[PDB]
Amino acid sequence: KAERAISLLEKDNKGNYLLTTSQIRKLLSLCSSLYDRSKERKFDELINDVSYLRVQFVYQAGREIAVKDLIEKAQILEALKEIKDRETLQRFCRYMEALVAYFKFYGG
Amino acid sequence: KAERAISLLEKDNKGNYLLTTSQIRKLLSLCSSLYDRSKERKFDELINDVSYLRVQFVYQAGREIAVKDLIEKAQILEALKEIKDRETLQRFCRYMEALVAYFKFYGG
């Protein structure tokens, strides 16, 4: 969950990451706005935001080279199919926060 | 909705797609400008844009070979007749984004 996030994210390629935290404010805006809203109502009611969350990880993957190299390694599209319950979705929301904390520790 | 759009769009013919996301900004400019406007007022009020939206999928289908091969496979003209309600129109607007995000996932 959070133990493998320190080794898989560090093992990359060339140093000096050109990607910061401002250019990734688009795909990281729906992940934080989903964990705090799925606990109020049921999971079968919100059927428009679930299908739209997968689109953000596809349209933004073919524009910048600093996006495709991270999704294929962290397996983001693989966990989008296993989830189906409200309790399972709560676990995926916590895994996204691990890829951001360890990213700013080695650089920015 | 989004599961069957990743396999039908990939199954095409010859590789190296010569059509980019900039030459199809005519038929895609009205669908994005209709979803944000239909959520405010009613559906029976806007009657001049519904009939004009279907014309874009017919006039632009005989001027380029990279358009007819996509409409007949994705079945775009079939969904234009089933819609009749404001809630049903919101579902067709989300399906159009699958033909744009997944199109640039394998190339551009």
Place this chain on the structure above:
Amino acid sequence: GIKRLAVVRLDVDDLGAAFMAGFSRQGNGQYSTLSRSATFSRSMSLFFKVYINQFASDKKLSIIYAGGDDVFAIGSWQDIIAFTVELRQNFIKWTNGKLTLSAGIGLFADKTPISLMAHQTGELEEAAKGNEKDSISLFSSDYTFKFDRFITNVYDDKLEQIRYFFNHQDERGKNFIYKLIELLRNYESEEKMNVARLAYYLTRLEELTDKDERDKFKQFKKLFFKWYTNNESDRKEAELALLLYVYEIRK
């Protein structure tokens, strides 16, 4: 500082036991002379009563019940914490490191009845006997270290090398330390999540501050990461060191 006070009850150990047969080391001498035990209790009785008033200079205190067993100190906590561990350093050199010492610093509120204020500060010494014989407690019954370990780790580098590093980031950034003492609270829940969350709120204190001095946060960032991820029992030292710095500069 605020309107608080500390109550410490110093009580030397290794006194009631090993007092009559503690001089045996050679089969030649008997080591049972009554004069040998008379000068043993008289030499230590001079330090816990007469020498206490000598070391009370340049400080506002009030000794209560002076004796060679258990004493009672009260006053402003701005120096009792530093004077309690300082008095023990003079007893180790006097005995060449052979007799341990214990105490119990306890903080309470202002204008409190002595019937319960002086009674709750004595339970910290009894609760510290779970390890062995050299331990002490701070606020609650959780900070039960090894007494002498408080000066060799917490007061050593965790307290001296922080008085001038974060002091420049005070006032304008005093609220940035509140999130550090609270993050170490929920520890028995999940261990994997407690480590990844700490790496996010710590890196934000390097870019927001002044980047003109590189040696301002580099020495604090390296020590904070090693003092937290090294041992399970070592995390209590960094948690207590950061808590005492908040009460230092306050009001």
Place this chain on the structure above:
Amino acid sequence: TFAKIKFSAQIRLETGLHIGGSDAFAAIGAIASPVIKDPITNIPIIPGSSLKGKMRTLLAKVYNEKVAEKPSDDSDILSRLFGNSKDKRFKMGRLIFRDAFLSNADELDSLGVRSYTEVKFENTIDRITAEANPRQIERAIRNSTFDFELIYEITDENENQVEEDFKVIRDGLKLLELDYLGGSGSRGYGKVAFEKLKATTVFGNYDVKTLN
């Protein structure tokens, strides 16, 4: 004798404002100054502490003459409405607000809403160089109602300012609409609008004279 007059109103936000709250304790995206919300759900609740202080500040400048140097010490005709920490004759105040919640969620989701709060991008110029420090803030939505109830009570004994206290509350709520509410609202972010200002009797001990 002793009644509990309630002034139920609907605070309609004609312009999205900003209120500072807890930071670096919510989620991982605690940037752009995140506005404090509900500790259980995600509905952006408005605090009641920002309303008691803003209404008293704008009212203690036209109904008095002496310049207010310290709080709880200005004239006497308005000290009994909010409270006084230095006076002994009275301590509890008659004006009690309430942490209103966005009750417009019954029909807000039907009109297609992405999120309850959006991030606004701004910047600044040092008037000697180019653009520097591209900051960012976070605002709320527009045209949202709130369940605001004014809990008012009389002291039974000193019951002779009822006809005078009504014109003060009505003038204070109308003057509050012509001023921003929250933080960093000098650019035009606050400006509330009290919609449907009605009064009712829940305890049932006093009649109803006026309505607005």
Place this chain on the structure above:
Amino acid sequence: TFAKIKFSAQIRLETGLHIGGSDAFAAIGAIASPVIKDPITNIPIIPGSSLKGKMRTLLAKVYNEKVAEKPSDDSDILSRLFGNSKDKRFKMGRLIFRDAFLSNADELDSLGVRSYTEVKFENTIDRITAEANPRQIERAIRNSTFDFELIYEITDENENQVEEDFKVIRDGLKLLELDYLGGSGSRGYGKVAFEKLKATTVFGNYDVKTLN
């Protein structure tokens, strides 16, 4: 004593300008320079932060005697109009703007328009080759009104400098019409025009003297 003067006007856009919205936060159409709009509806609204910073910039270069090195520190005759963060005498200003909304929708739909905002295509020349980097921007419509309300109030004590402050506000609004507003106005996109400049009293405490 304490009045609430409102300078109601209609901002008529003689030329379509551009305002940089919240990029990488909207829907799938986050490219082509997304313009900020209404968080609930689709009517484009103009922010108030671009008006308070632009009016103070053009005012701090003709009514002063010292080059402004840092914000909130330039002269003194205009620091009390917008505010001051380094002064100890006065803090709150006397000019409050408002996020004006496009109120021209009463007759815009009768003419039959396609959308509220169009996409304009532009590019650049590297002075060594032909067309390079085909970029694109987004603009608004032309000849559109906006309900602009200026919340003006005095602090009672500042009563002997009322007529002196009226000539400063009128000079700032007239000079703003001869300059681009918003963003990317160097090519000729801004240049606003205040139409129907009048004044009225809402609280009712000061007489009506000025108008145009």
Place this chain on the structure above:
Amino acid sequence: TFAKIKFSAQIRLETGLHIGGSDAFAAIGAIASPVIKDPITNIPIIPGSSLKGKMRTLLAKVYNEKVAEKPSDDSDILSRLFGNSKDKRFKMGRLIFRDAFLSNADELDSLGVRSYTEVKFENTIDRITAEANPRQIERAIRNSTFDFELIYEITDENENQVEEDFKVIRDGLKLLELDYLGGSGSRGYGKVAFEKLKATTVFGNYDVKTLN
């Protein structure tokens, strides 16, 4: 000190030109590059972005001392007139353009016209064969004017060379008359003609020197 000089002129088109508008974005007629027009009416307006990239290009090849290779980096006598993205001394430009509208509609219908845009038949020959790819274009009207306004201002310090800047603007506008403006004007489509080149003072802070 701070003046607002306006150079009012009439851009008379001696020959109908063509400007490539927003491709694949029109209404009922989007054939052969639809020319950009007005988002409200139908009168084709000329964009102000073409007047800034063409006038600066023709001027940066006669008043310079080094071959330019990228924008915002050519000599120094003309960098303060349009802008500079590298120099920290100045960032804002002193020249402000405006989307000139066609004011000739008050008497154009009296001469008996059909429409504002027509389709011109223009193709190409592949030399080795006969007619190949019968393309076409879309031009505007001929002998039309445009109400163009040039907003000029000084920054107080830029006063000891006011007369030096007048000879640069006058030489740049006269040189543009002998060159095509817009797009694909190599076949004799552009060639503008500035009519009634006069100056006036709107703010009123500097005397009137030039006139013709």
Place this chain on the structure above:
RNA sequence: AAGUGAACAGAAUUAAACAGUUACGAAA
């Protein structure tokens, strides 16, 4: 009466992406 299918490249980039004046106020 007379083959008429605007052809071919780049699909928004390089600065800067929290700066500061600062914290339990008067009772037990």
